[PDB]
């Protein structure tokens, strides 16, 4: 849950802060966190299940890191970041939906979807950051 | 250089060829005796150790078996052709052949012996080889002990040779060299289907010497740097130094009666320095060796050349102190005075470099953007073709960073320098003019550097680990100025022969590294599993480091070698070595028990026990097992040295079994057995408290005894109170020992695959870069 | 019946050196925020010089503790701990030499050396007690004989 | 004991003292020898015993 929230928070921050013309000093830490998320998620295969009418969806992560060269972000940087953020937002939304449509009598507080159960592994703890909600 | 001689003198791998079947046992004729001890007219063949030299003491026996493991590893071949071992079997009906000559000797001895059964002679007559030329196979008869057969069968079935063809040879070349359009490869041979080769063991560094082994890593990186220097091409058709100096003098407008900073701009501009800088940069990046920046703050041309250098080379390639000094000189001499900013008071040890502070503090977009790029210009760690590599930014590879730097410099030249005399601005402008008059040549130089770097990086087999080295390589900024000022338009790229030589040296070193790691790991694991608790393993690691051939073990302390031992101990053993050790562990008890020099123990019972009947001894006081007796471990007794228990048992006549590899005295005298001498060989243990001198008595009572008439004339079965824990030899069954050893009929093994590939280069003017444009485009 | 100054069981087995290593390993990873990088590197590499001898230092600690225990078994007078007027000066360069040069050759007191040490201690203790007895006897005799 | 020459070279290489600006460059590795190690061992154990 904390890892899923961290993914969603990172993507929201990327959408809000990665804008054309912004100083890189305004996104340096955000870019570092986003790249850490990219590294952690890279090479992992996920599946959001087909309970009900939810389509079964497969997710692969092979994204390159975000750049660190521009003093001020430009249109090309924003477009590349937009593509990556769109894929990640789709993945996160599908994972959240797959989790919301599931319930358990024995352990309801534990993750029910296999995607969120996989995100509860130790290797994904790196993605975790600010939990302010 | 001696380092290059050491690194290029490594041979690929010494190929081992088996000339004879490995053997630990041999048949031997022994006289046999009847149940009453009378000698039979017939003899009998028994299995006996060929080299019976097992030592006294269980610990010494385990050491002997470790040495045997080393011997078997030495004798294990990379490939085998049994026809080389094949010899004529004179008694074969079809005049066939057997392997090895020792088998033929056994066959001849058995066949000629009058006591051999006719069935065995028939069997020998049938022994011949079968050749399947269609399958390229041959089966040869061989006479081997089951342990010998196991070892030889493993050797036969676990050879290291694999088929070789033109496609394999071509794929041996690195994928990036083949995918490069600037090199044309060719072959003039069709390798036959019977060609073989041995793959190099290019496993990545399992010891992670880049982590926490800083002196060894310094040595490794120095060797890599020397090799990379040796293979970096020389710059051709450089601009004439005299003409370039004249042009620089005219641009700088040097005055005779005035002291000027611009004079120093001409310091150290020569082709030797240009080539030295090119080689140093490419070799340091390839070997991932940290560089040190040598410059004089009074030479501003050095500072502008340093701006270019910091633009192109990632800043992690330079030791931090030198990088900080160069950046501070650039900021306080060029950047800040241009913009009227106060001189930066930079603190030594600041978390931020001078360029980061300047980037925060500079309001000019071009200069600040260039500063930001320099700050964030890093290598990219990418696993290409299975090898970790440090990849330059694409803008560096295509040379666009030179355009960004030139925009920054042009913005600097336009500044007013409000707080400096006009001559200071004039000098800075003149230096910038010198650098900017060669903008196209600088783009060409950056592209050439990047292309040479990646082309020579394609030939690296070990991971390029980016870690700061203990010592650095000094780079003079005057050499950078020389390279910037004298580089022409001629494109120089590594020769295909140079690339192949570099790749072959790298492969040889990598294979040697992995093979020596395998040897050390096997030896350490075997010593641990053999419980050699008194063995100090420093020698093993010392031999390992000696055989790597690039370290001076006299400079390596013992603690470092033991840390290497600890790292080696965690690695798995190579499959062939592990299986050989498994065979040895399985069969070492049987190998030891076959020795005639030592016994497995002595049972001191204080009751009469009838001597066992065995055909090859007659009557013998041999114990097949230590059942129903308390056991005293002689090894533990010798290690601890406490003889209280053994003394108490010997003084109280309490039956016991002293267990441990012991030498024994073979006695055939019946009168000695009647005298009960075997029971008198243990008081010395109580007297001297030493069991190394213990040497029990093994009675061998049969008709060859002088007093056997006592046994014959009194229907008397000999009895003794002491028994020798010992085994009896296994009978040699000729038919059961025959094995059909199968191997390939014939093949040819090749060493240097790239010897079969002839490679040439396209015209250097037409050589292209990764982006399909010519590397150098200036007229 | 003899007072003895004994070490922590973690010193005796040398396990605590691991903690030391741990601690100074962390010191090798630290930033040293405002320290010059060359001096920082030198300090960190010296810290690692001591760190990478973890096994040797564990062996040295166990050896020193064992020798101390064995030779303390041969002490007959109470090991009273007092801060003495004059000290024994210990050069830390000698400590560095011991830490950086100790190998893996165990050396323990010889049985004859232990017996000689014990005999010397016993002789000194016995002489001390006998001379106390003589002094007390003579003083008491002089007082009871009224030898003012 | 570990060879004094090898350990001295290792320590010198790791410390890089010559590259620093330490007013005492030679005195750093002085006193590192087998005799000093033996003196330390004896001094420590003897002081603890006495």
UniProtKB/TrEMBL annotation, chain C:
Post-translational modification: Sumoylated with SUMO1 and SUMO2. Sumoylation of viral proteins seems to have a positive role on viral replication.
Annotated localization: Virion
Subunit-structure text: Homodecamer; each decamer is made up of two conformers of VP2, called VP2A and VP2B. Interacts with a VP1-VP3 complex. Interacts with the intermediate capsid protein VP6. Interacts with NSP5. Interacts (via N-terminus) with NSP2.
Domain statement: The N-terminus binds RNA. It is necessary for encapsidation of VP1 and VP3. The N-termini of 10 VP2 molecules form a cylindrical hub underneath each 5-fold axis of the inner capsid.
Similarity comment text for this entry: Belongs to the rotavirus VP2 family.
Known function: Inner capsid protein that self-assembles to form an icosahedral capsid with a T=2 symmetry, which consists of 120 copies of VP2, with channels at each of its five-fold vertices. This capsid constitutes the innermost concentric layer of the viral mature particle. It encapsidates the polymerase VP1, the capping enzyme VP3 and the genomic dsRNA, thereby defining the core.
The protein's name: Inner capsid protein VP2
Source species: Rotavirus A (strain RVA/Monkey/United States/RRV/1975/G3P5B[3])
The organism's taxonomic lineage, starting at the top: Viruses, Riboviria, Orthornavirae, Duplornaviricota, Resentoviricetes
Residues of the whole record sequence present: 494 to 641 of 887
Automatic annotation (TrEMBL), chain D:
Modification after translation (UniProt): Sumoylated with SUMO1 and SUMO2. Sumoylation of viral proteins seems to have a positive role on viral replication.
UniProt record similarity statement: Belongs to the rotavirus VP2 family.
Part of the intact protein present: 346 to 395 of 887
Signal peptide: none
Subunit structure as annotated in this protein's UniProt entry: Homodecamer; each decamer is made up of two conformers of VP2, called VP2A and VP2B. Interacts with a VP1-VP3 complex. Interacts with the intermediate capsid protein VP6. Interacts with NSP5. Interacts (via N-terminus) with NSP2.
Function, in words: Inner capsid protein that self-assembles to form an icosahedral capsid with a T=2 symmetry, which consists of 120 copies of VP2, with channels at each of its five-fold vertices. This capsid constitutes the innermost concentric layer of the viral mature particle. It encapsidates the polymerase VP1, the capping enzyme VP3 and the genomic dsRNA, thereby defining the core.
Protein name: Inner capsid protein VP2
Domain remarks in the Swiss-Prot or TrEMBL record: The N-terminus binds RNA. It is necessary for encapsidation of VP1 and VP3. The N-termini of 10 VP2 molecules form a cylindrical hub underneath each 5-fold axis of the inner capsid.
UniProt lineage: Viruses, Riboviria, Orthornavirae, Duplornaviricota, Resentoviricetes
Species whose genome carries this gene: Rotavirus A (strain RVA/Monkey/United States/RRV/1975/G3P5B[3])
Location in or out of the cell: Virion
């Amino acid at each position: 849950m904390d890892v899923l929230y961290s993914l969603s928070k990172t993507l929201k921050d990327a959408r809000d802060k990665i804008v054309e013309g912004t100083l890189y000093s305004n996104v340096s830490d955000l870019i570092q966190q986003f790249n850490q998320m990219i590294i952690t998620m890279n090479g992992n295969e996920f599946q959001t299940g087909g309970i009900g009418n939810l389509p079964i969806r497969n997710w692969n992560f092979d994204f390159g890191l975000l750049g660190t060269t521009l003093l001020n972000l430009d249109a090309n940087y924003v477009e590349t970041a937009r593509n990556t953020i769109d894929y990640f937002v789709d993945f996160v939304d599908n994972v959240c939906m797959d989790e919301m449509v599931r319930e358990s009598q024995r352990n309801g507080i534990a993750p029910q979807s296999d995607s969120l159960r996989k995100l509860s592994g130790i290797k994904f703890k790196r993605i975790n950051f600010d939990n302010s909600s | 250089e001696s380092i290059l001689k050491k690194l290029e003198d490594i041979k690929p791998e010494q190929v081992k060829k088996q000339t004879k079947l490995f053997r630990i046992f041999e048949p031997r004729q022994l006289p046999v005796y009847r149940a009453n001890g009378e000698k039979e007219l017939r003899n009998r063949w028994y299995w006996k150790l060929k080299r019976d030299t097992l030592p006294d003491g269980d610990y010494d026996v385990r050491e002997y078996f470790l040495n045997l493991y080393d011997q078997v590893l030495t004798e294990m071949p990379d490939y085998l052709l049994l026809k080389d071992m094949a010899v004529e079997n004179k008694n074969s009906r079809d005049a066939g052949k057997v392997v090895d000559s020792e088998t033929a000797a056994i066959c001849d001895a058995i066949f000629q012996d009058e006591e051999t059964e006719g069935v065995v002679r028939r069997f020998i007559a049938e022994m011949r080889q079968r050749v399947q030329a269609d399958r390229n196979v041959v089966n040869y008869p061989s006479i081997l002990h089951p342990i010998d057969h196991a070892f030889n069968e493993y050797f036969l079935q676990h050879q290291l040779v694999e088929p070789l063809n033109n496609d394999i040879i071509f794929n041996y070349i690195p994928e990036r060299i083949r995918n490069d359009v600037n090199y044309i490869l060719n072959m003039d041979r069709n390798l036959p289907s019977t060609a073989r080769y041995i793959r190099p063991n290019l496993l990545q560094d399992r010891l992670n010497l880049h982590d926490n082994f800083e002196s060894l890593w310094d040595t490794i990186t120095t060797s890599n740097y020397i090799l990379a220097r040796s293979v970096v091409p020389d710059l051709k058709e450089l601009v004439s130094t005299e003409a370039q100096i004249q042009k620089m003098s005219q641009d700088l407008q040097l005055e005779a009666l005035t002291i000027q900073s611009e004079t120093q701009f001409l310091t150290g501009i020569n082709s030797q320095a240009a080539n030295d800088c090119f080689k140093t940069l490419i070799a340091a990046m390839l070997s991932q060796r940290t560089m040190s920046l040598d410059f004089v703050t009074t030479n501003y041309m050095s500072l502008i050349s340093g701006m270019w250098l910091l633009t192109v080379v990632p800043n992690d390639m330079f030791i931090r102190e030198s990088l900080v000094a160069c950046q501070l000189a650039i900021i306080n001499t060029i950047i800040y005075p241009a913009f009227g900013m106060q001189r930066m008071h930079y603190r030594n040890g600041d978390p931020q470099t001078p360029f980061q502070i300047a980037e925060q503090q500079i309001q000019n977009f071009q200069v600040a953007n260039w500063l930001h790029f320099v700050n964030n210009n890093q290598f990219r760690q990418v696993v290409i073709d299975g090898v970790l590599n440090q990849v330059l930014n694409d803008n560096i590879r295509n040379g666009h960073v030179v355009n960004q730097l030139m925009e920054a410099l042009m913005q600097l030249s336009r500044q007013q320098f409000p707080t400096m005399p006009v001559d200071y601005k004039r000098s800075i402008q003149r230096g910038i003019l010198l650098l900017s008059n060669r903008l196209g040549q600088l783009v060409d130089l950056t592209r050439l550097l990047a292309y040479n770097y990646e082309t020579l990086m394609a030939c690296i087999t070990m991971n390029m680990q980016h870690v700061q080295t203990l010592t650095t390589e000094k780079l003079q900024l005057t050499s950078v100025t020389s390279l910037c000022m004298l580089i022409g338009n001629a494109t120089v790229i590594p020769s295909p022969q140079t690339l192949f030589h570099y790749y072959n040296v790298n492969v040889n070193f990598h294979s040697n590294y992995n093979e020596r790691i395998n040897d050390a790991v096997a030896i350490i694991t075997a010593a641990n599993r053999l419980n050699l608790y008194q063995k100090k393993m420093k020698s093993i690691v010392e031999d390992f480091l000696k055989r790597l051939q690039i370290f001076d073990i006299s400079r390596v302390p013992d603690d470092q070698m033991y840390r290497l031992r600890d790292r080696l101990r965690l690695l798995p053993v190579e499959i062939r070595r592990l299986d050989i050790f498994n065979l040895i562990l399985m069969n070492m008890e049987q190998i030891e028990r076959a020795s005639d020099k030592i016994a497995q123990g002595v049972i001191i019972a204080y009751r009469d026990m009838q001597l066992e009947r065995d055909e090859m001894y007659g009557y013998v006081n041999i114990a097949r097992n230590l059942d129903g007796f308390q056991q005293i471990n002689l090894e533990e007794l010798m290690r601890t040295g406490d003889y209280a228990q053994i003394t108490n048992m010997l003084l109280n006549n309490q039956p016991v079994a002293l267990v441990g590899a012991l030498p024994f005295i073979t006695d055939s005298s019946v009168i000695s057995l009647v005298a009960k001498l075997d029971a008198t060989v243990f008081a010395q243990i109580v007297k001297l408290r030493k069991v190394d001198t213990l040497k029990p008595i093994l009675y061998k009572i049969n008709s060859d005894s002088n007093d056997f008439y006592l046994v014959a004339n009194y229907d008397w079965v000999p009895t003794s109170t002491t028994k020798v824990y010992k085994q009896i030899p296994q009978q040699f069954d000729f038919r059961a020992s025959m094995h059909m050893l199968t191997s390939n009929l014939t093949f040819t093994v090749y060493s240097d695959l790239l010897a079969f590939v002839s490679a040439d280069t396209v015209e250097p003017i037409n050589a292209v870069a990764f982006d399909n444009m010519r590397i150098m485009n200036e007229l």
